[PDB]
Each structure stands twice: as C-alpha cells, then as structure tokens.
Amino acid sequence: APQDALRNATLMSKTVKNIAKLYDDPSVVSQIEKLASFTSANALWESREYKAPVMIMRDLLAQNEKNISESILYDDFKLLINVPMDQIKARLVKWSSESRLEPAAAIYEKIIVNWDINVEDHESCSDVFYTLGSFLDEQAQKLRSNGEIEDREHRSYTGKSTLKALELIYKAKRHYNRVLLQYNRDSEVLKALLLQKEKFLWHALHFYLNTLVFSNRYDNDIIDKFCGLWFENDDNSKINQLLYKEIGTIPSWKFLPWVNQIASKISMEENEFQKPLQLTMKRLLYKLPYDSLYSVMSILLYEKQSNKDTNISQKIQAVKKILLELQGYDRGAFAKKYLLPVQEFCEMSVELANLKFVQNTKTLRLANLKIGQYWLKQLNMEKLPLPTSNFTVKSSADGRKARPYIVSVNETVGITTTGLSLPKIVTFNISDGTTQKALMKGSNDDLRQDAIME
Amino acid sequence: IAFDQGKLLPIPELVPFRLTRDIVDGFGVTGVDGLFRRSCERVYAVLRKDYVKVMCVLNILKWDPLYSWVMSPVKKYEHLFENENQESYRALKGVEEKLMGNGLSVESSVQDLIQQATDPSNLSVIYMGWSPFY
C-alpha cells in the first residue's frame, strides 16, 4: 500500500536532483528523470489526488513525444542499461487513457488518441491491450443502454403522428416543412450513435483478441469478457466477418470452461457468427479430442431419444455433419482412434444406465461384468482416455497424452444401490493411479441443469 | 434450484445457510462467533470488492443458454401427498443485491444471515427437507 510506497517515491526525487552533475551524459540523464517522474505519478495515483498523476503523465508524455534527441549512440553505459528501464510511450499513453477516465474529466475524447496507438511487438503490450479493451467495453455498454438509443422510439412516434396531423395542415405547410427537416436530423443521429456503438465494440474485441495471443497473466478473466461481447452481438458482418478472419489467430485451445455453450450453439445457417463458431469447434475437436468429445457424444446420445423438437433435429444434423467432416480432416479418419472408442464408451455407459434397473431385491448384481462387455472394452481401450479426474493442457501444450491411458482395467464388481433408483459399481480399477472407483447413476432428473451449476 | 424457487414450495425454505445445531457443534466452543464469522467476513468482503467478475461469470454462462428457468410441474409440489427471458433477468439481478448490498459495511450482512439462519422461529417451519433435528 501507498503508506509505504510513497516514502520511496519521495526518496527517488531526493536521489535524482543532481543526476546531471554526477556525470556529463545528457543522453541518459534525461531518461532517468523520465523514469522517476513516471514512478511517482503512479505512487500518487494509488492513493489520492488523481489530479496530480494526470498532469504529471500528460506533461511527461508530451515531453517524451518531444523527444528531440529521439536517438543517440549515448553513453555505452546507457546502452548497457537501456533495457533496464526505458519507458515505452505506448504504456504512457495507456496510463493517460485510464487517468482521464477514472475521473469524468475527459468525457470520451480519449477516442481521438486511442485510434493512434499501433503498439509494439514484445511484452507488456498485453497490459496495454487489456486496458484499452476494458475502456471500450465500458463505453459500449454505457451507450447501448443510453436514453439516446431509447429515443429512437420518440422519433418513430413523431414520424407516425407529424406525417398525419401536421401533414394534413388543417390549421400550415410552413410548420409541416420543419417536420421533415427535423425528422431527417433525428434519423441521422440515431444512425450515428448506432455506428459508434459498433466501432467501440469492434475495437474492444480486437484488443481482447490480441491480449489473448501474447499473454497468460489474466487471461482467466479476459476469456469470459471476450465470449460475452461476441455472443452479445451475434448479428452482422461488421463484427463477425472480421472475427472470422482474425479469430483463427488465437494460438491457444482454451474456451474449454464453456465449450458446452459453444457446441450447443452450433446449427445450420448461412450466416456469419455461425461460421467462426463452427470453425472454433473444429479447431478444438481436432487438437484436444477427449476434452470435447464427451460433450459431443453426450449430445448425440441425447438427440437420438425423444427426437421431437425441431431444434434438436437441426442440432443433430449440424453435429453429425461436423463429426463426419472431422474424420475427413483427421487424414484418413485418423481420429477414429478417439471417436470410435468414445462413441463406444458413451454407448456402453448409456447401456449401463439403462441396465441399472436390474430389479431384484438385491443390492449387488456383481459376477464381475457377467454379460457386460466392458470386460472387452477395458482391454480394447489399451490406451483409454480419461473420464474425469483432474487434467489440463493449460492453454495448448499437448492434449495427446494422459495418465489414464494405462486404465485398461475394470475391477468389475457389485453395483451400488440404496435409495432412489439404482447405480453402477465403482469399478474403474483406476489407471497408473490406484483410485478413481467412481460409479454412474443414470436416471434423467436435471442432467445439464446440474452440470451447468457445477 | 440455482436461484430462489425453494422460497415457494408447499412450505418454503430458509435462504440462509443451514447453520443448525449439529453443524455448528463441529466448532470447538465459541461456535459461530469465533473463527466462523471471521472467515465469512473475509470472503464476503472480497466478493463485494471485486464484484464485476462474479456477474461476468454468470452472465456469460447463462447469456443465451438452453437452460430451463424454473421447472415446476414435476418439482416442489411433487413432494406433496394425501416469464421467459424476464425470469433470467429478474433472477440475475438479485445477485447484484447480495453483492454490494444496501446494509453495507460487510459485517451487517454477515450478522443478519446468522441470526436468520439459527433462529428457531424460522427453523420451525420446514417440512422434512433436512429434518433439522438429529
């Protein structure tokens, strides 16, 4: 906290008063002063007097922009230490955008600067993109919910009424002439605010997208924000064609925290949005099979039953089409290595649930598998994908390997039963591990409704 | 449930967490008012402090879901013997009331929930459910 940090910010001032006199090096001492000014501006901002950091930063930025000595060989020492401090004007600009908005003393004028920063190419630029993206989202929502947009209704009411009563001019065409002129002005304004909404949105998406390319420090928060803005505006080409073209740049294979909500939105339409939605899905299915396939196999099992909804019928074809295309994409159905097995596993699991109702007064029904075919399945799956446990690729890494491959075992045994319905045996026989032993209890009940809360 | 709902029923539930007599018996003397409140206060204060991320998570996962907003015909009165997008909106907004709040000062929320949670005046309503005895 500042109660401590300010003391050092103060010390720094005391310690730089004579830097121009420690050695004769104008080419570096000016840089040292810039560092010090920046540092204290932040130390102050962290507490109170928001008015000071902003002036400090505005003046510092202007002075740095007026580099004058934009470049020099400088002292060899300066060169040696160049990477130890520098400044990055792109970063200074970010700080001005934030310092001017935290207080309201800038309205949205920031946009006049914002468009100009073309950043750099290394590191920390992700902080810059992140902040710019946050500022664009706030502006976009403030405008979206603004009375100015609501006002379209008033313009419409005027168009409907003035066009009749004033147009009739039962009692001056001269007054009616004002209706057209003002109406046209109202329409132009409404058009204009809608355009701004879209520009703030597009750039917000662009910046969050870039942030996710270069860093993983707080991407845990960004990905939800990104999803929101994208799914919030599943409408025109203005956003979605650009994303189609750029979204393929995401180097990661994340999105996983809500893959279920991606896959479920896939349908059959000629529209944008659906195109990059489907593209993203393929990206993940191709590279991280098992982490996506369980939701796919689950929906297919769901779909085959109670095929009454018009939407489920459409969903079936959309999913089925992609899955067939995926085996094509695989090379020569190379991915059959995962899909055939996944389908078999899912089907077998479904059978176990259906067979849970074995009746009898017993609470066992063991004899190993007896008639179950898992006995074969545990062997066929000599490299069995992991059901659950805890497994991740972090971002990308490599999803082709897991401890569970050595899970070609079943420990077939007696079924659990006790209260409602009946359940499966813990079975599992673990893997490399000596745990798992987690049983199924299928019925119906909430299904997806519980999974989402988890 | 996810949100509310149990506040209806053929005899409604108490929203505060079931801090009944045995649960708190695991608190080795000075139940509730000792470590338990202190931990609760830090947690609640943090959620109030960051705020937006919580709303974000809910908003994204249920932005335009295929999720069913309250199933009544096979629930609730199911155990008795002898709005659309507006519901989503209404329910999610209640989150904003629990976060931040109007009582403010953190402690006030914590103390209120505790009194409600343990007061037998409310406990002595509920049909079975957890059967707050044993």
Tokens of A370: 């007896």
Torsion region of A273: left, alpha or beta (phi above 0 gives left; psi -120 to 50 gives alpha): left
A-to-B residue pairs, Cβ atoms closer than 8 angstroms: 33
For A309, half-sphere exposure in the C-beta direction (CA atoms, 13 angstrom radius) is: 12
Burial classification of residue A96, based on how many CB atoms lie within 10 Å of its CB (0-12 exposed, 13-18 middle, 19 or more buried): buried
Say if the Cβ atoms of B60 and A228 lie within 8 Å: yes
What DSSP string runs through A1-24? -HHHHHHHHHHHHHHHTTGGGTS-
What is the least distance, in Å, from the CA of A325 to any CA of chain B?
25
Task: Look up tokens 């914002």; give the residue.
Answer: A114
Residue length of chain B: 134
Three-state DSSP class for residue B95: helix
Residue (of B60, B56, B41, B50) closest to B100 by Cα position: B50
What are the two backbone dihedrals, phi and then psi, of residue A275, each rounded to the nearest 5 degrees?
A: -60, -55
End-to-end CA separation in angstroms for chain A: 36
What are the two backbone dihedrals, phi and then psi, of residue B55, each rounded to the nearest 5 degrees?
A: -65, -35
Tokens of A327: 């085996």
| Residue type at B36 in one-letter notation | F
Residues 394-423 of A with CB under 8 A from B: none
What DSSP string runs through A114-181? HTT----SSSSHHHHHHHHHHHHHHHHHHHHTSHHHHTHHHHHHHHHHHHHHHHHT---HHHHHHHHH
Say if the Cβ atoms of A452 and B65 lie within 8 Å: yes
Give the C-alpha separation, A292 to A285, whole Å: 6
Count of CB atoms within 10 A of residue A379's CB?
A: 12
End-to-end CA separation in angstroms for chain B: 25
Q: Which residues of B touch A228 (CB under 8 A)?
A: 56, 59-60, 63
A258 within 8 A of B61, measured Cβ to Cβ: yes
Residues 6+ apart with CB under 8 A from A134: none
Residue (of A30, A29, A52) closest to A41 by Cα position: A52
What is the least distance, in Å, from the CA of B60 to any CA of chain A?
6
Give the C-alpha separation, A368 to A413, whole Å: 5
Please, what sign has the CA dihedral across residues A248, A250, A253, A256?
Answer: negative
Give the C-alpha separation, A266 to A407, whole Å: 33
Measured CA angle at A366 (ends A365, A371), to 5 deg: 90
Residues 6+ apart with CB under 8 A from A415: A356, A358, A363, A364, A365, A366, A422, A423, A424, A425, A439
Tokens of A319: 């999913």
Instruction: Check if A302 contacts B (Cβ < 8 Å).
Output: no
Residues 6+ apart with CB under 8 A from B117: B14, B16, B17, B18, B19
Tokens of A262: 């991606």
| Residue type at A284 in one-letter notation | L
Give the C-alpha separation, B10 to A182, whole Å: 59
Give the C-alpha separation, A23 to A81, whole Å: 15
Q: Which residues of A touch B2 (CB under 8 A)?
A: 449, 453
User: Treating both helix axes as pointing N-terminal to C-terminal, what angle do A310-330 and A289-303 enclose, rounded to 10 degrees?
Assistant: 140
Please, what sign has the CA dihedral across residues A191, A193, A195, A197?
Answer: negative
Q: Which residues of A touch B66 (CB under 8 A)?
A: 264, 448
CA dihedral B56→B57→B58→B63, nearest 10 degrees, is 70
Give the C-alpha separation, A226 to A387, whole Å: 29
Residues 6+ apart with CB under 8 A from A294: A342, A346
Say if the Cβ atoms of B56 and A452 lie within 8 Å: no
- Nearest-by-CA chain A residue for B3: A453
Report the structure determination method: cryo-EM
What DSSP string runs through A279-305? HHHHHHHHHSHHHHHHHHHHHHHHHTS
Tokens of A173: 């065409």
Residue (of A355, A343, A415) closest to A380 by Cα position: A343
Give the C-alpha separation, A441 to A352, whole Å: 9
B91 within 8 A of B69, measured Cβ to Cβ: yes
Residue (of A388, A355, A386) closest to A369 by Cα position: A355
What are the two backbone dihedrals, phi and then psi, of residue A353, each rounded to the nearest 5 degrees?
A: -65, -45
What is the least distance, in Å, from the CA of A194 to any CA of chain B?
22
Residues of chain A by 3-state class (helix, strand, coil), percent to 5: 60, 0, 40
Q: Which residues of A touch B91 (CB under 8 A)?
A: none
Closest Cβ opposite residue A231 in set B2, B64, B68: B64
A415 within 8 A of A307, measured Cβ to Cβ: no
Residues of chain B whose C-beta is under 8 A from some C-beta in A? 2, 53, 56-57, 59-68
List the single best residue of A227, A235, A267, A314 to mutate versus B (max B Cβ within 10 A): A227
Q: Which residues of A touch B56 (CB under 8 A)?
A: 221, 224-225, 228
Give the C-alpha separation, A141 to A98, whole Å: 17
Give the C-alpha separation, A263 to A320, whole Å: 12
What is the least distance, in Å, from the CA of A2 to any CA of chain B?
19
